[model samples]
Target: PRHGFVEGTEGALPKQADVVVVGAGILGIMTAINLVERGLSVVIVEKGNIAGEQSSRFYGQAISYKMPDETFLLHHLGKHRWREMNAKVGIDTTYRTQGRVEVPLDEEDLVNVRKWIDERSKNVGSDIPFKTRIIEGAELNQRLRGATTDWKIAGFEEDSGSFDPEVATFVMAEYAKKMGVRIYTQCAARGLETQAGVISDVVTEKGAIKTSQVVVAGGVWSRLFMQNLNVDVPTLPAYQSQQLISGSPTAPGGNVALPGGIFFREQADGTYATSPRVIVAPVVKESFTYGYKYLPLLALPDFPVHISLNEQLINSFMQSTHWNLDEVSPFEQFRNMTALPDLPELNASLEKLKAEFPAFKESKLIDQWSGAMAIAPDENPIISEVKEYPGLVINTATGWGMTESPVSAELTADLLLGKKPVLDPKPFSLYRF
Candidate 1:
């Protein structure tokens, strides 16, 4: 609950930094840690509290089964880093491969699940030791106690994991501070000052941090940030809701993908973190510019994305793409998108869960929250150095942004340090789009 309390460097923004990472979420924090380890002075500038957005407000499910191919590969490569990260952070991040059980919602979902299984079979290397099994309805129901409706197709992977998103991100920020990575919270990075087509300084609300290298990992704000620099990285914001239930049926621990858009992860405590797979896509300025590009994700049979074209269209005017660094910019104007749970949708999910599983009759919602996710077209990550602008790096529209931090940051850091990256770059590169 007290996850926002990060001990920022108690002083003025540094006069200079070798690398300025904008955003104190998982990607920025881990990337700063990677940069400092690679012998660079990194400074993280957050507009508001650290991990105050999607980072702390996600499902906290660390399973790669949700994604395909390159994204799955990236998650695979980053698996070892989670524990390593917890070790370096010197705190229990609660990263565990408690495993994941997924059941198809319907016939269409079964087809998608089969396809994923086939794709995963070939995509993974022989060297990579992994095991997955099909859990028949009978056995699955047995594993998942108090199930009324029978699931047709199911899959289970022992390597899947989950962690405390809030605590994990905070610990990373704290560790970054301990390692001399100056983290400036409540500091909005306005824009980059360039000299001769090269990054010269990072102008912020506090002050300008003179630096040649700068990385913008600002969640939903990254698109706006890049747009100001004449770069086009179209990303639409997707709203999602989550809730913690106190009296949900005691089932198998870890991640569970049930029928009818229901997903619940058993926490260390008795409470269950439940969320729907649905997301509301608000029609904004970018919807006109890059709406067609998102058709693939919108057409996905498994994922449901509802569209909103209301006052949001007018409120979107607040997101002025271009602005003057000297004046109050959008980042300063809207520090963060207010996270509010969709009570109706969340309660509906609970109703669906109870219908299929009578054991959840006593489920009582205790705590709930929601936020927007920055999703790129095709839903892959965008982590690349701007070609036209030297000394500038970016990581945004990252697929499953919260859980994808380690590998995304590792890939970025490897590129920054001129080392061979852990995962293939072509998939996550900005050039692809």
Candidate 2:
């Protein structure tokens, strides 16, 4: 796979800027673009290539149908804003609005589905832009194209869809670059410098850039980087694997999630990106460091936390939790955080799909890969200013970084510019934990 979409820059690092954004992923790049558009000089520092990690490794669904009220609104805004951004940047990110649906496997699954629907309805009321309804009996099978079995109810949202994560993220990165935002790929931010407890500059491998504002959009590396600053972010890396299945003429259009454990979305190329709902992550030393905190989440059957013993366990144990700015850190040691795809987990998912959908029996696996997602204890992002450290903001989006990137970036830029935000900043604050 050629990642030729992201554009990069070469030369010495600038001495200073109005703002320095750490990490060149979608969140950081988009924030830089908005900041520069607002007449602020900005620079983005990356440990590796742009959009090279989880930014380009997600399932690509831009869903907004069923979520908490505030989060639903954020994702809803993202769903609409991404189209505008793609148009303005003159880049076709392959964004499609074919809609999305989730089919329940049994009575228990139906209960949970209705609970979510009702919760959403109660929180958002009737002011939503699109329709979200439950289809049952005959309509459920018809909408699913006879692929499901024992489905009692199905949640359908007519406005949800999917897009190319790699293209969407890098297109914004390139757009930011064109807007006078300097990007330094392969340049790792080692630590942050402060004056009287306020962020003054960011120390990077290339050099230090003097600045009053610093945004941490470092994805999984956020916790480690912030640890050096004595900030406990409570974030961990969760691994997942996905497979691209060949197209079937009988396959249903739109994104589909089958209750218990499978999801799939059709691409513009006719193939479907499919994966299991289970989080097949490794149990590392970090897991124990934060495992007890996630006991409630691990107890839920629907929240399947599949633990495996793998190389990541060893890698996690060997990495330094704290380091001096003068020494090479783990961020520099591993340019890109990656893991091996759990083939057994992927095979079970494919087998389940084939067992229920005869059309998938003829569909061959085109490609398969793995991605490491940042999971916060609360299962949400921390997009707020540090209480103890002024001028320093944390903008990690946990696992939903891609889907929430557009509006999250807007909110981050708004907070940085001292402007009114689209939504109240209380819910996503870092001080809650």
Candidate 3:
């Protein structure tokens, strides 16, 4: 219910910084915190207010299951580190261990569910041992007390949980500020200044901040920002929406991922955040330009993207790829894009949930909002150093923005400092594509 609660920074823009981070989402703030804590001067330039975009507007799941082998360690370590940071910094993100489950609708669904669980088990080393088990029949009914489904099979994870995205992001930004990280809200990054192929400084709408290294954590705007340097980042924007409902007759006790497109988690305020288990990534110019490379994902029946020329298309076409450092870029033209939800799809999803879980029928819609995601061609992040540029690093968190941002921050900082990374960076390298 509360919106835009993040505090803003004051004082004049600095003449220089050791590193300049673009975007003020969780990734940007966390990166600044890590760099500053290590005694490096850092400044963050944000187009909008802190956590004003997708960082605060997410599903808020501190998930611990079904992640790619490459990022398994990050999810496992990030969640625990989040808890420690919340306690150490005295910020309650509403991080709870309510747990999570994956329910199957039929025999085919069960096979698929088991296949994922087994595959995930193979790569989960002792460093971060994950917990998971299968539940069915009477036990499933007991776990989901008010459900009216034929879901005879389900995979449960006792460690997975949820959190408050807005609270977490705002608190982290505040912590970074307290540690002397300068964040300039409404100061959008126009372009980068380079000297003989090395990043020299970051040019923002307010002024240019001199820096040896730059990290582009601009989320959906990453590809557009790098275009000025004539770099190709295969990142495209996709719109995703969610709704919160109150007055449920029964609580599922934990996060629920049911078959036939439905997933929800019990909220701390007696309401539940619900949405279809789908990502409505609409097709745009980038889709056709790189469609051949994305053919594998596009071929999937549940690719989580919708082919359309909706407002997302119009918005992208309106902006120019190249811009002068002194000129105003599209990033400043729009502080944030307000996307309209597909009410028909949302209403149908609610009905489907109620059909299986009778208690949802009594719920009332409270609020809903939408934001765009900068998805990569393989649905994974490109958190690698830009080999073409000596002092530039890419820090897009892919779809796991909130879930793995802490690890992304640490990994990116390591790359910037030339230290050994906490995890292997080969899997997330841009060259993989």
lDDT of 1 by residue, 1-433 (tens): 5344686788767788889998988889888878887788888899998888767877777766756776876776566567465676667776776677887767776777777777777767536665566777666766577667666558887677677655667767777788988888888998989888777889998989898888889988898888899988878888888887765445545677776676777765656778888888988877997799888776766668899776567768877878999889888787767656789988888888777666677867677887778888877888886887877878878647656787788788876666888777888788787
Give the winner by TM-score.
3
Candidate 1 clash pair list: none
Per-residue lDDT of model 2, residues 86-192, tens digit only: 57888676777767778766788778768877777666633545557787788666667857476666788766767765466776777788888899988999998
Candidate 2 off by > 4 Å: 1-4, 122-128, 137-142, 146-152
Question: Better model by TM-score, 1 or 2?
Answer: 1
For each candidate, how many residue pairs have backbone atoms clashing (under 3 Å)? Answer: 0, 0, 0
Clashing pairs in 3: none
Report lDDT (CA) for all predictions.
Answer: 0.77, 0.79, 0.79
What is the TM-score of candidate 1?
Answer: 0.93
Model 2 has how many clashing residue pairs? Answer: 0
Instruction: Write down the lDDT that model 3 would get.
Output: 0.79
- CA lDDT of 177 in candidate 1? 85
**What TM-scores do the predictions have?**
0.93, 0.92, 0.94
lDDT, residue 140, model 2: 68
